[PDB]
Amino acid sequence: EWLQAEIARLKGKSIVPLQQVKTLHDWLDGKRKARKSCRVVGESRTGKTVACDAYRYRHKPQQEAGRPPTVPVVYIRPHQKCGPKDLFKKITEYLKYRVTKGTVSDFRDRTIEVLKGCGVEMLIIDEADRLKPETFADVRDIAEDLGIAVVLVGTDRLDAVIKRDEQVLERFRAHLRFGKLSGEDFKNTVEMWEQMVLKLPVSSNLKSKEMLRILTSATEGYIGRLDEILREAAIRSLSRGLKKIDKAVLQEVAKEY
Amino acid sequence: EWLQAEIARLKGKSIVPLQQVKTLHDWLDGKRKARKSCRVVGESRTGKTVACDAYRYRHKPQQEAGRPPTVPVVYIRPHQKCGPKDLFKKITEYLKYRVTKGTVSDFRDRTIEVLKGCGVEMLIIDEADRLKPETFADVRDIAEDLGIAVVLVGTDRLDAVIKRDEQVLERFRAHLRFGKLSGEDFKNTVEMWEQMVLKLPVSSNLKSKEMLRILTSATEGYIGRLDEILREAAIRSLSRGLKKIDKAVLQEVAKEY
Amino acid sequence: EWLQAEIARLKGKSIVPLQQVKTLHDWLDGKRKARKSCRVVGESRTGKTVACDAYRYRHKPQQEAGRPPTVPVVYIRPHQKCGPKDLFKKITEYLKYRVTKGTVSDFRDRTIEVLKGCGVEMLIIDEADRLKPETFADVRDIAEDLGIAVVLVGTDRLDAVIKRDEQVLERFRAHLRFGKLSGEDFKNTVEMWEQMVLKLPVSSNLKSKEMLRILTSATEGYIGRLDEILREAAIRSLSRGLKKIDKAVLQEVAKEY
Amino acid sequence: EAPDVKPWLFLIKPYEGESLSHFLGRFRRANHLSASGLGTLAGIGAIVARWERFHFNPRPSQQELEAIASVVEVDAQRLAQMLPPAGVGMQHEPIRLCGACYAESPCHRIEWQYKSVWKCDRHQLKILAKCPNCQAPFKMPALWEDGCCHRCRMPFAEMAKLQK
């Protein structure tokens, strides 16, 4: 019945344009035209990884029948304590280059060789604070030896990791900060989320002063929490047979968090 | 499109004949004829790699009709945690004497045949502290066996590595320091960058007291930042259709740092 | 706007040539020549630190082509509970070397190498009483081993700390003392502030008996308070459209102290 | 994950008559592979390091050429044209060169290793078996990276002038 699909929209993930996302896309384009490496910093629930996904999608690969593809933007999330062979394996896999085995020195040479001719312009690294300290040398090498901009993405832990090596601090000195929601921006967001994401059989009227009090204490400005609290309350309302989010179950959900 | 022809120029890198470059080259020559090893130290944005590279190109390898090329000067940047084989392979491939599978004793016997016959007077090792501690045995060996000057280039950490091994500390005791710009020298360099690098269709007059305040705060004397900030501000200005850098656009760029 | 610029001027520092500072510079120059360690003592608002910074800038680094600079005066200020590694760390940074990971014996051995080669004649330590008691062993050691005048600068509490250690007191007995302003000297100095610092559009007549009573009670002879009070009285008066300071407006300010 | 790319390599097109040693050598420079690395990717192990030396003592089987065909995107029947035809005896000791034709197509032709070939018919010139100036014997054709003598650095195209 109709009730079964509705978990899926709620559970299903989506991207909503927001001021913070637009700000990055334009700044990254300055960096990509200029071929300047830089870093993006901010708290872990500000939605940094998602903004970078949205950016990647705007520049599709071009592929002919025979020769290899043009791919302007590369995005990678390293694993914890990611070493040199692991970094080169991820750059190589995001392009689906078929060769899979090799010595660390062979992957190094092979990675430089697939970034060239393939025409990469920007390399984005997410949770870059996971990089094992010696792998920043292979990143400094990619950045100086090829006309490729490198964009490190992380939390305030990224900085503490950068400040331990003058060689790295200086190539990556410029940066942009992802901030939290507040005031009218938090209010307008909430409203967008109701019209663009929840779409329930009857409005939940979230901008009301009494509901914004409950959301603000529950979420403390993180877009992450706001999305999770709202969807959880919506599904949990629909499964109880209500046609909207009930203030009573919004209060119940906000009690767990 | 005239606009496009120019942004692709400002994207690229160039060399300016600063007093610091002429100072290095006049020092290295003494050492070359004297055949003595030495090291060069300084902070990571002082442009050590560029001044050394520019030197390498002042001495084109020569060729007669019969015997192999005579190659007075070699420049190499090794890989992080560089082993003995990795050092020998990179020396050997710079000289273009390609070598097969062999064990490490075979890489050494070939490293000496390619450094002999072919005149080699100086070896330059960039980022010398990428070398594993044992490889210095190979570096000393070469330096003492053949009349080849070896120059080690690096940051303050390089000396922390060297002072661990008294064997190395003594062959490479003499040194030179790359330093940051200041006073009249920063101001003269800024005026040089404007007429030499930027070449914008009307003057911006960067040596003005008001602009030197912004540049001295933004760059802190590193030739790296000075070159980076000015290219970034010129590209940003031209993309807006401005014929010059202005005070407000230079501040909007400097505020990212 | 005019007032805006006068706020932006008067919120900043300046240096006035005064007898106390000319006396310090003649005294320290004798100690730099003769290489004897000594101390500068006096009350906390006498301007000992402006006198020492004014001295440092008369002896800037003398930079040659390829050696480290000669740095006649090194001036440092320790953080609270300064240990043996923090003293070497700051000496090393002040001469622009990068400090890397190692143990205590390494910082000390490296400190002596950068103090040697680089001409160093005098070391000035401000707020000397932030030093942990054991670090004085390293301060004496340098002062005896190398041709270095160490100057300890501080308040009367410094001597209370020093008298706890017979070994140190005897290296650092020679002293110059800063005092307070009085009589003709306080009166003459007030007029120097009007002509060189305040720079408002008409004479405030601060040297008259009726105004000197206000300032004497307000400042008690400390150059610090005199500076601070005449700057606040100038700022406050300019915002109300006066060209000068007057009896009531200066009493309005003084009544805060 | 990738944004809709097809799995790929730096493929190369074979020339009109090059030897299997030379072709594999080009393939493992277009992609940066070692000889045992290419053999491992193909799943035939250390076999490739014989074929680059012309050590065809046991000849390349149909199943081994098909394994290489799955890497290099050339079918087993076009790979077989880079080897001697059935009963055409080759020699794998003296590597040999025309050099006059190396300006028209920079490759080692398989036919220069046949025991029956002594002159190139396109140019009516005697085939070389050493560098005409320094007398050095040529490297195996997989290693023809520079297209010149490895000892005296004379281009193979200039050995056109020094033969017959």
Ligand SMILES: Nc1ncnc2c1ncn2[C@@H]1O[C@H](COP(=O)(O)OP(=O)(O)OP(=O)(O)O)[C@@H](O)[C@H]1O
């Ligand atoms: N622009 C956006 N549109 C819609 N939802 C968003 C957006 N940005 C973030 N979110 C929401 O944020 C949550 C996921 O947060 P996300 O992974 O983007 O955070 P992050 O700051 O990248 O995390 P971390 O730094 O810890 O890796 C999801 O609920 C997702 O819907």
Ligand SMILES: Nc1ncnc2c1ncn2[C@@H]1O[C@H](COP(=O)(O)OP(=O)(O)OP(=O)(O)O)[C@@H](O)[C@H]1O
């Ligand atoms: N001599 C120079 N003339 C012109 N531009 C220069 C010069 N030196 C440096 N630059 C500019 O500043 C940048 C930094 O210089 P460079 O990369 O050579 O620094 P470095 O001291 O070798 O760095 P590191 O020590 O961190 O490896 C260059 O990419 C270039 O844009």
Ligand SMILES: Nc1ncnc2c1ncn2[C@@H]1O[C@H](COP(=O)(O)OP(=O)(O)OP(=O)(O)O)[C@@H](O)[C@H]1O
């Ligand atoms: N000789 C001077 N010339 C110009 N301005 C001065 C002079 N002496 C003091 N001042 C001004 O008055 C202030 C008085 O503080 P000062 O810098 O003298 O501190 P200090 O007494 O040396 O500090 P400490 O607490 O360490 O003893 C200075 O910061 C400066 O603004």
Ligand SMILES: [Mg+2]
């Ligand atoms: Mg993320």
Ligand SMILES: [Mg+2]
């Ligand atoms: Mg460098």
